[PDB]
């Protein structure tokens, strides 16, 4: 059959004992083989391009590899220059994008056969460039032809939206300053997504590019407390808000505050940012029980459940809906199942049961039965034992974050209202990523940061 070339992966046995990257990705050899499967659909109506939220020339970078099978470094420099026109985080997006609902979901070969593995081919281009120093050559090539323009820009938040906005403005000659609330930049790339999905080398290399581009990162600076938007407006020609949507949704049901009940954000912050699993070499502690129940079935729940098993716990995922309703990446759902995570579907917590010492012991669920209609409960229940409960039923923007700047228009959910050029109700102030869309995707944050850098530039030209 003419199926898609597979990617190598470490065995369950080896990978469950550490936090190392599971999927080893394409080699130069396998990348060419997968590139030659693409039908080279015309650039103007190629469905894959349409499916990508930032519209990367997918056949363009694929054909670039195919024509330079002779020299890989030439082919990668060419494929990369094309990717970098629309996307500046290909190593993150190629690994974490939910392709099944985007580029690959749109791919014609998918209708009769397997769609082209666009994500792993984009990832290969980026990883090859990063390992062989191709991206370093191009970045230094950019820095030489960079001339200052006397103008300063402040950036609120150091996640993928803010990091992308800063890089593109620096390239334009602006004097960029990022204000970050935590002690390390990256946002979810530094506290949320783990090493087994995203090697920390990508983030470390991304901060090297910005330190080379001259951008300054002000850590331990909470905009709204340390400094206000008004104060920032008095010093900077423009501002860009990229504060995300990190407040955890916690159900106010009996037992929510028993010991052993964590939000996924806390549990992942302690592991990813604080390296608690390395306690006592690292000072941040973490308590993990013999039996863990994770509430939810998004990427956040997969990350939490998969992290818990690496700490020796037996893990169970409890979801409100069914197997097909899960929002997590189908590739990461597969990884959690092979690793041994048990799945419990159509269950909704109605209480977390505990002992007289205030520790969690069991979780009580209502059996549910199967878009803005939602579902309903059967009146039938089921109780499962648990020593640790991780809540992963979503995140939301800090609904009280904007109360230090009332002139900034914000909607019913805490999302910053923006115009077609991503400008807020305050001229000079722009905003992107989860601050405007609510909980979304890395590509959508990258893109908004890219778009706002063009609008800040245009708005600062007249």
């Amino acid at each position: 059959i003419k199926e898609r070339v597979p990617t190598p992966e470490r065995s369950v046995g080896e990978r469950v004992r550490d936090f190392g990257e599971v999927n080893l990705g394409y080699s130069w050899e396998l990348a060419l083989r997968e590139a030659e499967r693409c039908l080279q659909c015309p650039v103007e109506y190629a469905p894959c391009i349409k499916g990508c939220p930032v519209h990367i020339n997918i056949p363009g970078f694929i054909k670039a590899l195919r024509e330079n099978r002779d020299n890989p470094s030439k082919a990668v420099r060419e494929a990369l220059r094309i990717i970098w026109r629309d996307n500046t985080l290909p190593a993150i997006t190629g690994r974490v994008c939910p392709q099944e609902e985007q580029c690959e979901g749109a791919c014609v070969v998918g209708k009769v056969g397997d769609p082209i593995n666009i994500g792993k081919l984009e990832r290969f281009v980026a990883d090859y460039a990063r390992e062989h120093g191709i991206d370093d050559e191009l970045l230094l090539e950019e820095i030489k032809g960079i001339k200052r323009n006397g103008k300063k820009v402040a950036i609120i938040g150091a996640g993928p939206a803010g990091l992308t906005c800063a890089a593109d403005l620096a390239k334009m000659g602006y004097e960029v300053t990022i204000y970050e609330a935590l002690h390390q930049p990256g946002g979810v790339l530094t506290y949320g997504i783990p090493e087994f999905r995203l090697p920390k080398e990508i983030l470390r290399k991304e901060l090297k590019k910005l330190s080379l581009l001259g951008v300054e990162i002000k850590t331990d600076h909470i905009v709204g407390k340390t400094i206000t938007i008004q104060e920032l407006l008095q010093e900077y020609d423009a501002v860009f808000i990229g504060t995300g949507a990190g407040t955890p949704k916690l159900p106010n049901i009996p037992g929510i505050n028993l010991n052993g009940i964590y939000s996924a954000n806390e549990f992942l912050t302690r592991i990813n940012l604080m390296k608690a699993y390395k306690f006592p070499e690292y000072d941040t502690p973490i308590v993990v029980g013999k039996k863990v129940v994770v509430i939810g079935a998004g990427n956040t729940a997969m990350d939490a459940a998969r992290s818990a098993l690496r700490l020796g716990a037996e893990v169970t995922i409890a979801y409100r809906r069914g197997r097909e309703d899960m929002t997590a990446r189908i590739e990461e759902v597969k990884h959690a199942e092979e690793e041994g995570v048990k799945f419990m579907f159509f269950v909704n917590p109605v209480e977390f049961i505990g002992d007289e010492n205030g520790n969690v012991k069991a979780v009580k669920f209502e059996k549910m039965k199967p878009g803005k209609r939602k579902i309903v409960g059967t009146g039938e229940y089921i109780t499962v034992e648990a020593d640790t409960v991780i809540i992963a039923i979503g995140q939301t923007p800090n609904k009280v974050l904007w109360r230090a700047t009332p002139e900034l228009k914000v909607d019913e959910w805490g999302r910053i209202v923006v115009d077609e050029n991503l400008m807020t109700s305050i001229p000079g102030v722009f905003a992107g990523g989860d601050a405007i869309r609510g909980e979304a995707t890395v590509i959508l944050a990258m893109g908004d940061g890219r778009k706002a850098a063009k609008a800040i530039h245009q708005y600062l030209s007249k």
């Binding site: 002690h183 909470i222 916690l250 205030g358």
Partner: protein, 282 residues
């Protein structure tokens, strides 16, 4: 990043730090705190700026030597070294309202968090009476806190042939409960307390027998201090609130005391493990 301009042992297990942090000093208000990381492999701990100079750009922190992070700061830090990360101001500033006759209590190093609050209440025209209950070698800020209506220092003995807590002097909580009947001898409009959760419950049970409104500086576990993790969550008025965002202060009649009490030493085992390993500095 943030220079330790001053460092001195002001009492038993109490260190004064005068940290250069112009970002926090220019904006901090009574009731607001900071998140500090002193070491590359270290944790983030909440501490309170006791005093500040907005012009000169410094904050004063008084840390009680409690375990690994607070002990490693006391032993390995020197006047001229820098704190890695100082994030703030954090939390909601304490309301600066005309309450009247206020009793502001501080158990142990809790008086350090009473000081910025009590001082501002007095300046705005409130008749503040501060109270400090602790061990006799742990008496701190007597002269300073002596700039109000009137101060009392009730100091139990740290008895050497006695262990750490029960049946009887971490049960210095017995005298704090006894002296709390400052009620029955005087009229109060507000009771405020910084102290261990169990001590806040015992005192509130006494104040409750009278109809005096009460505020409490709640100390749940904190990681980020910016509202993005919910470790600091408390059930206030039946609602799930985050103490790093909505607090640290909350109405003592709206708090679920039994819940916060069980959440006191969840990390105890790992905490004694972390100290034990560091103590092996021979």
């Amino acid at each position: 990043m943030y220079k330790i301009l001053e460092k001195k042992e002001i009492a038993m297990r109490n260190t004064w730090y005068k940290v250069y942090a112009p970002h926090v000093a220019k904006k901090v208000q009574p009731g607001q705190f900071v998140i500090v990381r002193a070491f590359p492999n270290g944790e983030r701990i909440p501490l309170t700026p006791v005093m500040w100079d907005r012009e000169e750009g410094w904050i004063v922190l008084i840390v009680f030597t409690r375990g690994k992070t607070t002990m490693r700061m006391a032993v390995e830090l020197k006047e001229g070294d820098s704190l890695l990360n100082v994030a703030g101001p954090l939390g909601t500033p304490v309301p600066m309202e005309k309450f009247g006759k206020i009793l502001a209590i501080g158990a142990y190093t809790g008086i350090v968090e009473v000081y910025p609050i009590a001082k501002a209440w007095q300046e705005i025209g409130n008749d503040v009476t501060t109270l400090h209950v602790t061990f006799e070698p742990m008496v701190i800020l007597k002269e300073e806190l002596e700039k109000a209506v009137t101060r009392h220092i009730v100091e139990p003995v740290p008895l050497n042939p006695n262990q750490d807590f029960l049946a009887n002097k971490n049960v210095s909580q017995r005298l704090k409960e006894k002296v709390r009947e400052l009620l029955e001898s005087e009229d109060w409009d507000l009771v405020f307390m910084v102290g261990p959760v169990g001590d806040q419950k015992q005192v509130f049970e006494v104040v409750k027998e009278y109809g005096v409104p009460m505020k409490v500086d709640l100390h749940p576990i904190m990681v980020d201090g910016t509202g993005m993790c919910g470790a600091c969550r408390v059930t206030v008025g039946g609602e799930v609130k985050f103490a790093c965002v909505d607090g640290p202060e909350f109405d003592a009649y709206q708090v679920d005391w039994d819940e916060l009490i069980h959440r006191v030493g969840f990390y105890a085992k790992l905490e004694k493990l972390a100290l034990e390993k560091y103590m092996e500095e021979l």
